[PDB]
């Protein structure tokens, strides 16, 4: 069954969770090529592994910047979780290591670019296009949640398209293994559940709310709650009140009313029947879940490649040195990394 598959998945995950891989490469083993994305204390570069000629995405965090942002424990979470998972829509760690200045995490490279880029350019996705992506998010959450993992940063910016037009759910800076309830204020304003905004304890159900926002944004081309400033966005989120575009099909609207549900006792994903309330919703009726997992389904859009290590589906960022101090920084803070 699904249950059987997940039981084994847990066994695989827990072994790595309890005994994390550590120090499995060195910077000098990679040739850096291009910055693919940037972050607060971090950035991701395309690199080439010299021994194999394989291309990877290398996330580089500045240890001092992590400490100033109070993201030490969150960073340890990201690395510990990503070295332990394995799922077709996740990019597990191939390698990690650290040096005097930086932390490094090396993962599968998705050459298709961010969903964000294509969604913004094209404007919106058709319902079948939106559903193709949603399905993979549904499956990924089912996997993560069964591992007691909450993801906490669903948005198109983090959804990477691969060469076959399938999705990688990336950036686990806020992902956490937690049984029961947690309190940290984190995520992205447009995608925050009202629980988070109202500083309640919360759980995995916030990932299912964020799914509602995503599917809305994919199908409309804009989010259900937007404004110029985060406060105004939080006002809209807690108000209740979601307006749907006229072109939203009947089934879509119903699915979204059930994901974007402020009442936790009624929010899909969170009920007695779990993920199956979503999986068996009429909007997903044409979804062959096994075939999505297996990647047998034909992608509704497939990225325009013209080489391996081609980066035309990414924006251009200024290229910053990767500097390495002669002194070790923050050694204690990151001892287990």
């Amino acid at each position: 069954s699904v249950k059987e598959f997940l039981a084994k998945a847990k066994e695989d995950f827990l072994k790595k969770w309890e005994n994390p891989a550590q120090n499995t490469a060195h910077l000098d083993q990679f040739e850096r090529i291009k910055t693919l994305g940037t972050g607060s204390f971090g950035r991701v570069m395309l690199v080439k592994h010299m021994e194999t000629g394989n291309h990877y995405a290398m996330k580089i965090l500045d240890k001092q910047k992590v400490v100033k942002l109070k993201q030490i424990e969150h960073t340890l979470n990201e690395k510990r979780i990503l070295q332990a998972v394995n799922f077709p829509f996740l990019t597990k760690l191939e390698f990690s290591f650290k040096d005097n200045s930086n932390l490094y995490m090396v993962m599968e490279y998705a050459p298709g670019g961010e969903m964000f880029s294509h969604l913004r350019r094209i404007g919106r996705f058709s319902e079948p296009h939106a559903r193709f992506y949603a399905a993979q998010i549904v499956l990924t959450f089912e996997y993560l949640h069964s591992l007691d993992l909450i993801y906490r940063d669903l948005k198109p910016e983090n959804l990477m398209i691969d060469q076959q037009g399938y999705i990688k759910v990336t950036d686990f800076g806020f992902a956490k293994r937690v049984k029961g309830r947690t309190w940290t204020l984190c995520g992205t304003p447009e995608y925050l559940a009202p629980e988070i905004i109202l500083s309640k304890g919360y759980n995995k159900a916030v990932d299912w709310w964020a799914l509602g926002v995503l599917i809305y944004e994919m199908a409309a081309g804009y989010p259900p709650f937007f404004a110029d400033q985060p406060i105004q966005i939080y006002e809209k989120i807690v108000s209740g009140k979601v307006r749907f575009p006229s072109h939203f099909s009947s089934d879509l609207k119903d699915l979204l009313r059930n994901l974007l549900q402020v009442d936790l006792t009624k929010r899909f994903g969170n009920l007695k029947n779990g993920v199956n309330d979503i999986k068996n919703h009429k909007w997903f009726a044409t979804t062959d879940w096994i075939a999505i997992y297996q990647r047998k389904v034909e992608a509704p859009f497939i990225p325009k490649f013209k080489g391996p290590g081609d980066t035309s589906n990414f924006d251009d960022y200024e290229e910053e040195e990767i500097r390495v101090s002669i002194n070790e920084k923050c050694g204690k803070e990151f001892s287990e990394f």
Partner: peptide
């Protein structure tokens, strides 16, 4: 239109995480 209001907004580009 809501589309036009979105496109005119300051939040059509990449959106940063919040943290405290």
């Amino acid at each position: 239109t809501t589309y036009a209001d979105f496109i005119a907004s300051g939040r059509t580009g990449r959106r940063n995480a919040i943290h405290d």
